[model samples]
Structure formats: structure tokens, C-alpha cells
Target chain A: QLPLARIKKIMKADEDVRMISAEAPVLFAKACELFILELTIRSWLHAEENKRRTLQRNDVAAAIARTDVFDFLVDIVPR
Target chain B: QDRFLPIANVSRIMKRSLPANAKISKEAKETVQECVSEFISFVTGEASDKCQREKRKTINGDDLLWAMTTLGFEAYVGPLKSYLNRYRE
Candidate 1:
């Protein structure tokens, strides 16, 4: 629900990329929505579970591992 | 500024996702910010390329889903794994 418009723009940023279908942007619309939504949900889950009132950066990082739900970040965070 | 996405609403979104007494940490707020930015930054490229090769100027939602596994997101993200990865690429 954020700016999937711009997200699709990033898609076109690749010169190798040309025509995009109507649903193409729509696909990303919620995909990114899920990306942001899912990560934050897990982030706070770590915060609440760790017994901290304030969520920490590590909690965000921790969410990537505390659960198997977020493995894309495993390589991105580089451990 | 082209690559930038704001953190204010993001922090707010995190609050609604949590129970009371949970204070959203600022650094954690920004940490999630980076995740979304990179997600948008990286994943979209593959779908566009797939569309390019097929000579179709139109992009379909299924094609984006198809491109996702190519990026390995199906490895962990549940949405893609449902019908995306089971068949293998």
C-alpha cells in the first residue's frame, strides 16, 4: 500500500527490463506490503519476547533468525 | 532522495502492530526501514527483465511471483513458497 508505483519504477530501472504487465505493479504492491508488514510484525515480536519495552536494532536483526520466516535477510545482514 | 523512504509512518505502523507498553526503538525503526528499501530496490529488477525477454510490454502479477523465486525469496518468505518454489524455479 506504500508506493508500489515507485517500486515498479525501480523495476524499470534495469534497461534490460521493458514492458511490465498491469498486475506486475499490483503484484509488488502487496509483496512489498507483506515485506514491510511481516518484518515489523516479527520485529516487535522479538521486542516483546526479549522483555524489552523498547525495540532495538538487534531485535530487527534477531527477527531474521529467531524465526525461519525471514531468510532473505540472512545473507543481506551477513551474519 | 530517489532511493529514500520515510521512517516516520513506518515507526507508527510498527506501533499499531504491537501491544501497549511496547516502545518502538528508534534504531530498530530505521533498521526495518532499510529492509523495505532494499526489498523494493532489489526484487523488482528480475520481473522487469523477465518481461523484457518475453517481448511482452505488460507485466503480470504471476510473472512477478515467478521472478521472486529466481531471487531466492521463496527460501523463507511464506507467500512465495506456497506455489512458487514447490515446483522448482
Candidate 2:
């Protein structure tokens, strides 16, 4: 899978950052991705549904809030 | 009578009555009720739909947060509906 491409931006940042060992940034980004996806699923569960319900809503919000996604963003993105 | 237990008991009883060779004891019913109460607490206390919109592919940490928030909302529909029905005012 091109899941590595899913994080191309990080890969482009540093040649060292691009090639990660299973020790640090790779684990870090993957952890971020895991929390991100889990929260995303939780959000879908609580969101509005037409025919079938999706896993999205407050629980997801709580999950993301529980993680560093919020702090990480405010630290980097120019909001 | 404890509040919140009956609803779960009702669910367990209903579930057990449906299939054969299923012995749902009173203790099991109470356990189901407790689980349901916990689930209800989870649904009511932490559920929302503040994310899940289309975003640029260049996702940031904020975007990941948004994605997570949206996903939670997706998971909270059914139990919420059940709560709403019981507490409709």
C-alpha cells in the first residue's frame, strides 16, 4: 500500500525525516494517524445519518481532544 | 428500583427471547442493564458532529482533529435516538 505516500509532506520535509526508523517519527506519525482515524470513526458514529449511520461525532471529538491533534495543529498551522 | 437498569434489562430480555437455546439469566439481564447505562453515559456525555466535512488533501494536525471529531458523531446515532425517544418532551 502507498500508505507511506499518505504522509508525503512529512517525507519531503527532511531527508532524515523522510526515511524513518521504526523507532521515532515513523511511530509518532503512525500513532497520530491511529488516533486520528479512531476519532474519525467515533465522529461518524454520532453524526447525522440518512439510511445508514456513520461512525462520527462527539466521541470522536473526545478522542481527538484526548490526543495531541489539537495542540499539534495550533502549534503548527497558522489559524 | 434503579433508574437506567430496566431499559437495559428490557433489551437483554428481548434479545434472549428471540433466539433458541439462549438462557439469559437475571444476573445477565442486570449486567446488560449496567452495560447499557454505561453506554448511555458515554453517548450522552461525549458525542458530537463537529467535523467530517470535505477538506484539502494537504491535511494538517488540525485536519486530523477535525476528522476524528466527525468520526465520533458518526458512532452516536442509534443510542441517541433511543434516548431521545424515551425522553422526548
Candidate 3:
């Protein structure tokens, strides 16, 4: 599990985030773990598709290109 | 120029799952930064929407947990509950 303290700090970093209840960071910590896992899994698939065992930037970019929810990140990750 | 989660933390997380020999590109790290920030927005937005629907504008911690479950992210619940109880202890 990631650090809840750090997670809370990140949440607070957002200017729009004014007040935080106790559970906010706890929720974020776990959410970040799951999100990383999901991204890693999808990226790993791209590595396999390219016949490479090692994961890289393009693999990650490909993952973002293919995912629907990640459309928001399209501009950041080029084709 | 948008503020996002720290790249150091993002790289740290990425390093955790990969092999020691695997290398991460600068671009990959940047991409992950945006990916995670967008993710935070999506999840938080879900909770925000719920708050609006029920007529309470406050986005409480409970609202976040509810959104995670409501949005098919049930896997996060068990660990989050454990983390919450640990913090209270």
C-alpha cells in the first residue's frame, strides 16, 4: 500500500481542494494502487504485442491510446 | 501548465512493478503524471456528482468510498477500510 500521508498531501495540493475529511486520503491511497496496477497491466500487454519483454514509453503511450477512459490523456501521450 | 501529482512519486510507483533492468523514459513518466491526475479528476468527479444528486454539496470521505464502489472499483474497498481502521488506531 502507498503512503496515506503522502496521498493526503497530494490531494491537498490541488487548489480546489479546500477541506478534507479524515477518510479522503485513505480512499486515495488505495485508488492510486489500483490505478497503477491497471495501467501497468495494459502497458505490459503493449510490450508483448511489440515482441519486447521490457516496457517503455511507447508501450505506455499505446496503452493510453487504446483505453477509452484515458481519452482525457490523449493530448499528453502522443501516438 | 496544469498542476499534477509529483513525477517523482509517479516514477516511484512505476518502478515498484517493473524489473530492475527495465528503464522508464522521461516521456513515460510525464504521460503517467497526466494519466493519474485525470484519474483523480474522474474519481473525484464521480463523488461530486453524487453529492449534487442527493442535494448535499459536501464531498465527504464516505462519498468517495461510495463512488469507488458504485463505479466498479470494489477492489479498493477492502484495503481502504483496512487503511482507515489503521489510521484510527
- Give me the candidate number with maximum TM-score: 3
* lDDT of each residue in B6-52, candidate 2, tens digit only: 44424433343223432334443343333333332222122111112
- Candidate 1: residue A40 lDDT (0-100): 76
Total clashing pairs for each candidate: 4, 48, 0
The model with the greatest DockQ is 1
Please write out the lDDT profile of model 2 over residues A9-47, one tens digit for every residue. 332333222222222222223333333334334333333
Which residue segments of model 1 deviate by more than 4 Å?
A66-69, A75-79, B69-89
Model number 1 iRMSD? 4.9
Chain A of candidate 3 gets a TM-score of 0.87
Q: Give the range where candidate 2 chain A is weakest over 10 consecutive residues by summed lDDT.
A: A15-24
Question: Tens-digit lDDT track for model 1 on B1-85?
Answer: 4553567756666677777777877778777777776776566667667776777776666667767677756743466435334
What is the two-chain DockQ of model 2? 0.02
Q: Give the TM-score (0 to 1) of chain B in model 1.
A: 0.61
Q: Candidate 3, residues A7-51: lDDT per residue as tens digits? A: 555555543455567667666766786787678668878887887
Residue B27 of model 2 has an lDDT of 43
> Native-vs-model 2 lDDT?
0.33
Please tell me which model should have the higher TM-score, number 1 or number 3: 3
For candidate 3, give the lDDT: 0.70
